[PDB]
Design a protein around this ligand. Structure first.
Ligand SMILES: O=c1ccn([C@@H]2O[C@H](COP(=O)(O)OP(=O)(O)O)[C@@H](O)[C@H]2O)c(=O)[nH]1
Ligand SMILES: OC[C@H]1O[C@@H](O)[C@H](O)[C@@H](O)[C@H]1O
Ligand SMILES: [Mn+2]
Length: 291
């Protein structure tokens, strides 16, 4: 049950004036696509604080990737869900390498030790299995957000993203035709998507939803990965290929714009992005992924 919102004074929405004319702000299945200028964060904060919403954030920091945790967590403290209850779940093979970051009130961090796989591909792929400790999240949070660690927050990421199931537009493909999307194209893989199908190319680095929908997604992607393994096939882009297949067949109830997953080194700061909220930290793939 949801109580009434309080009286609030804010600018009237104008029906014959769009917030954004340059971009698509709603998908064909009537899910909002979240860009700056489409939301009044004061209305949304009130809605979600009246539900006493708790947001869980999962992040994996395996082997050398523990080096990314200090910046990831300190910038999350400045920009992620501030004002709301937040539970960070840091999955790592080195609990003593987790930095001691100072947290604001109402925010907590749990360290979950897990095994380290040798291949960076398996480390990345096995997050779906790892996420899918399930009774724990149902008791502790309302929503789960699942992100890469080699990242930093630079601007607001808040309750405008929350919904039963979201994906994020990959910053390399948001202007691309679907034939150019790097979906898995071999019919032998569970992740296969034909050239004439696909709405968007979603990023594996940022998805989330309610706990129920995230466990559905991560269980289905892990099951599909295990089928591929038994068939001796590994999808072209690993968990991201499976996430794409799942979100094609189970449409997300919001889509985040690429404000929410950007790489300023590779892609700069285009005019269509009013804010760069969550961005890649430069790294050397070969060095950081191997001993
Ligand atoms: O040795 C590794 C390789 C990957 N990861 C995790 O898997 C995510 C995805 O891999 P990565 O960021 O390397 O993929 P990219 O964004 O470079 O495609 C990382 O953010 C970490 O959360 C990790 O912890 N240790
Ligand atoms: O083509 C898809 C790939 O695009 C790259 O930019 C990215 O680093 C990979 O993680 C994968 O998303
Ligand atoms: Mn990454």
């Amino acid at each position: 049950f949801m109580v009434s919102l309080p009286r609030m004074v804010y600018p009237q929405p104008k029906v014959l004036t769009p917030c954004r004319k340059d971009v698509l702000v709603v998908t064909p299945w009537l899910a909002p696509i979240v860009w700056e200028g489409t939301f009044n964060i004061d209305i949304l904060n009130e809605q979600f604080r009246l539900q006493n919403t708790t947001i869980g954030l999962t992040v994996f920091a395996i082997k050398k990737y523990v080096a990314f945790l200090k910046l990831f967590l300190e910038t999350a403290e400045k920009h992620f869900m501030v004002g709301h209850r937040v539970h960070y779940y840091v999955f790592t093979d080195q609990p003593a390498a987790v930095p001691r970051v100072t947290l604001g009130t109402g925010r907590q961090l749990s360290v979950l030790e897990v095994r380290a796989y040798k291949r960076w591909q398996d480390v990345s792929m096995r997050r779906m299995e790892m996420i899918s400790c399930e009774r724990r999240f149902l008791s502790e949070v309302d929503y789960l957000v699942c992100v890469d660690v080699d990242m930093e927050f630079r601007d607001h990421v808040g309750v405008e993203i929350l919904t039963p199931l979201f994906g994020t537009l990959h910053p390399g493909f948001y202007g691309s035709s679907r034939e150019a999307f790097t979906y898995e194209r071999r019919p032998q893989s569970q992740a296969y998507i034909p050239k004439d199908e696909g709405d968007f190319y979603y990023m594996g680095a940022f998805f989330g939803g309610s706990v129920q929908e995230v466990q559905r997604l991560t269980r289905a992607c892990h099951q599909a990965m295990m089928v591929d393994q038994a068939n001796g096939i590994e999808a072209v882009w690993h968990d991201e290929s499976h996430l794409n297949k799942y979100l094609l067949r189970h449409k997300p109830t919001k889509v985040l714009s690429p404000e929410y997953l950007w790489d300023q080194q590779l892609l700069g700061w285009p005019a269509v992005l009013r804010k760069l909220r969550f961005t890649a930290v430069p790294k050397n793939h070969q060095a950081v992924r191997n001993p």
